[PDB]
Amino acid sequence: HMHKKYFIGTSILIAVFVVIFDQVTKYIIATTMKIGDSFEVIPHFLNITSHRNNGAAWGILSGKMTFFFIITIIILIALVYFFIKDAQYNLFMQVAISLLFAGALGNFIDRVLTGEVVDFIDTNIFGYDFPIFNIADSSLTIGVILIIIALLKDT
């Protein structure tokens, strides 16, 4: 029963726990497997398929890591500013912003260090040809679902 202006204690350790598990899982796949290897988790529906993502879906681009770099930082700053200005007394949105912040930072570390992103989650639950993603992608998607539910107020 705590009603605070900014739930900084809950928001940060949510971001802490997400980044830790994203970076750890990414690192476990990098050191136990080779690119292209795959082992099953839940048969016929979830595999751990080692992949690396460097934006090759967009085709030829002069420098995209720099553009991803500028994009991620601009959005990371806006999330903090969103957190302060319009997320007051609203734990639900502050959690969502944290999920958005943590999911962006987790991938941000991958690109800054290696110039790539470790992708290992390979499922057929969302149909096939759905790309291999990771925890940082999952936190972002969940954070978008929550704000879409938060955007579905006044309607």
Partner: peptide, 4 residues
């Protein structure tokens, strides 16, 4: 933000 996302991997790609």
């Amino acid at each position: 933000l996302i991997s790609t």
